[PDB]
Amino acid sequence: DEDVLTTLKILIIGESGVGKSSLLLRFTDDTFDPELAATIGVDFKVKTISVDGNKAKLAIWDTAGQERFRTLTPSYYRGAQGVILVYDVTRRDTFVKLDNWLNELETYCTRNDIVNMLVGNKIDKENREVDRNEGLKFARKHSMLFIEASAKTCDGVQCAFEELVEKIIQTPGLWES
Ligand SMILES: Nc1nc2c(ncn2[C@@H]2O[C@H](COP(=O)(O)OP(=O)(O)NP(=O)(O)O)[C@@H](O)[C@H]2O)c(=O)[nH]1
Ligand SMILES: [Mg+2]
């Protein structure tokens, strides 16, 4: 790790079934599992990437969307530097519930510079319920980055993680050791 600038804690949150774990598997393993199992507790994965000429090691916390499967919730948020909030563009309920997730995240307000990225997933699917502009409006109202993605067809996945990391490195007090 002699060329690694820093290790960043990235949290992935959002309702069950929106594709959190699939976005992560696409990013770490370059594959998709149509039958991926629901996450129980937290699934931690490490991946190192390069953005703007710097290598950042990502410690990624993929959490269960079902509240009954979450434990030590304060631990999930503690130290997070980037947060990816995910909704399913085919399920309006998962988009409206992002307000509950944001309320939770805002109780872990030690710093006010954590970088948030909103991802509307499953854009490959039929029967979209949330349009892109609606997701963009929410992101901008909350000063978040925004991307639409498909873990299934790869659209937007790499950018969701790269754009988040680029911005975290450009917010110095956030990662300086
Ligand atoms: N068509 C399509 N299906 C997807 C996409 N992303 C995930 N899925 C599917 O949607 C289902 C749930 O995905 P998953 O990644 O497990 O969701 P999750 O947000 O991690 N759920 P949990 O919070 O319960 O762990 C899975 O069967 C998976 O194949 C996508 O971009 N497009
Ligand atoms: Mg999962």
Curated annotation (Swiss-Prot):
It catalyses: GTP + H2O = GDP + phosphate + H(+). A motif (Switch 1) lies at residues 30-44. Keywords: Acetylation, Cell membrane, Developmental protein, Endoplasmic reticulum, Golgi apparatus, GTP-binding, Host-virus interaction, Hydrolase, Lipid droplet, Lipoprotein, Membrane, Methylation, Nucleotide-binding, Palmitate, Phosphoprotein, Prenylation, Protein transport, Transport. Transmembrane segments: none annotated. Mg(2+) binds at residues 21, 39. A motif (Switch 2) lies at residues 62-79. Its cofactor is Mg(2+). GTP binds at residues 16, 19-22, 33-34, 39, 65, 122, 124, 151. It comes from the Eukaryota. GO terms for cellular component: apical plasma membrane; cis-Golgi network membrane; cytosol; endomembrane system; endoplasmic reticulum membrane; endoplasmic reticulum tubular network; Golgi apparatus; lipid droplet. Ubiquitous. Belongs to the small GTPase superfamily. Rab family. The small GTPases Rab are key regulators of intracellular membrane trafficking, from the formation of transport vesicles to their fusion with membranes. Rabs cycle between an inactive GDP-bound form and an active GTP-bound form that is able to recruit to membranes different sets of downstream effectors directly responsible for vesicle formation, movement, tethering and fusion. RAB18 is required for the localization of ZFYVE1 to lipid droplets and for its function in mediating the formation of endoplasmic reticulum-lipid droplets (ER-LD) contacts. This is Ras-related protein Rab-18. It comes from Homo sapiens (Human). The lineage of its organism: Eukaryota, Metazoa, Chordata, Craniata, Vertebrata.
